Design a protein around this ligand. Structure first.
Ligand SMILES: *[C@@H]1O[C@H](CO)[C@@H](O)[C@H](O)[C@H]1NC(C)=O
Ligand SMILES: *[C@@H]1O[C@H](CO)[C@@H](O)[C@H](O)[C@H]1NC(C)=O
Ligand SMILES: *[C@@H]1O[C@H](CO)[C@H](O)[C@H](O)[C@H]1NC(C)=O
Ligand SMILES: *[C@@H]1O[C@H](CO)[C@H](O)[C@H](O)[C@H]1NC(C)=O
Ligand SMILES: *[C@@H]1O[C@H](CO)[C@H](O)[C@H](O)[C@H]1NC(C)=O
Ligand SMILES: [Ca+2]
Ligand SMILES: [Ca+2]
Ligand SMILES: [Ca+2]
Ligand SMILES: [Ca+2]
Ligand SMILES: [Ca+2]
Lengths: 130, 65
């Protein structure tokens, strides 16, 4: 819009520039990068054709492509000691908590969101966590 | 020498080829003659055969900070 704002203002969740150029999503946030949808991404920043992931040959620099293919972790309680729900993947698995709960860095434990503290605007007068 | 019967009837893993085998020294070494990168050790996956890669470790797995 033809305005100058201090660099700190450029991304702080406030429309200091009235056009809303400041706070633009492409400026303030970076989408997780991916690769063609016909492909696959290992842990390292590498992308390979998906058929290769289970070909018994190590593709990723960390050899993590072939590791998961043989295990249905949700059926194996030892690895999948998840608290609410588990889903298999051709490599590894993912774990998720019920609505109203959040997941912890072990990617298996679940904990209760204090919705009042995390989002006070939910209730117009008073909020109580359950 | 990955300790798998890849060549049909186990012909690739025979002692007369694998007997003196060793693997890149930075990788972990496992009781059954199989090697996985050291970080693989004790990550709840039995990447090596049986359980000797996981066996004996305390599974401390959370951000103590
Ligand atoms: C997730 O786990 C909870 C608790 O065990 C269960 O009530 C719910 O049905 C599960 N959902 C799915 C989709 O497996
Ligand atoms: C704990 O999490 C913070 C981010 O919340 C991270 O910066 C830190 O490296 C983590 N520490 C450990 C020991 O995992
Ligand atoms: C975009 O994501 C990368 C990691 O993939 C970095 O965290 C980077 O700091 C992000 N950039 C912005 C502007 O948030
Ligand atoms: C993943 O990222 C690539 C490179 O940016 C492409 O944009 C691709 O379309 C993306 N796919 C997904 C899943 O968003
Ligand atoms: C394997 O390790 C042994 C030690 O027992 C020797 O260093 C030998 O030269 C190694 N051979 C290779 C290159 O695997
Ligand atoms: Ca701003
Ligand atoms: Ca592969
Ligand atoms: Ca899996
Ligand atoms: Ca073999
Ligand atoms: Ca392991």
């Amino acid at each position: 819009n033809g305005q100058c704002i201090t660099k700190l203002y450029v991304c702080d969740e406030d429309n200091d520039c009235g056009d809303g150029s400041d706070e633009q999503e492409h400026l303030c946030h970076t989408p997780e990068p991916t690769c063609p949808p016909h492909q696959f991404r290992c842990d390292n920043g590498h992308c390979i054709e998906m058929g290769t992931v289970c070909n018994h040959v190590d593709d990723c620099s960390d050899n993590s492509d072939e590791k998961g293919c043989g295990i249905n972790e949700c059926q194996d309680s030892s690895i999948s000691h998840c608290d609410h729900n588990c889903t298999d993947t051709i490599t590894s698995f993912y774990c998720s908590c019920l609505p109203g709960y959040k997941l912890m860095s072990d990617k298996r434990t679940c904990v209760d969101i204090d919705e009042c503290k995390e989002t006070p605007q939910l209730c117009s007068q008073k909020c109580e966590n359950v | 020498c990955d300790n798998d019967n890849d060549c049909g009837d186990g012909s690739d893993e025979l002692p007369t080829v694998c007997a003196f085998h060793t693997c890149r020294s930075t990788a972990f070494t496992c009781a059954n003659g199989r090697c996985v990168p050291y970080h693989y050790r004790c990550d709840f996956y039995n990447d090596c055969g049986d359980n000797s890669d996981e066996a004996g470790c305390l599974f401390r797995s959370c951000n103590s900070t």
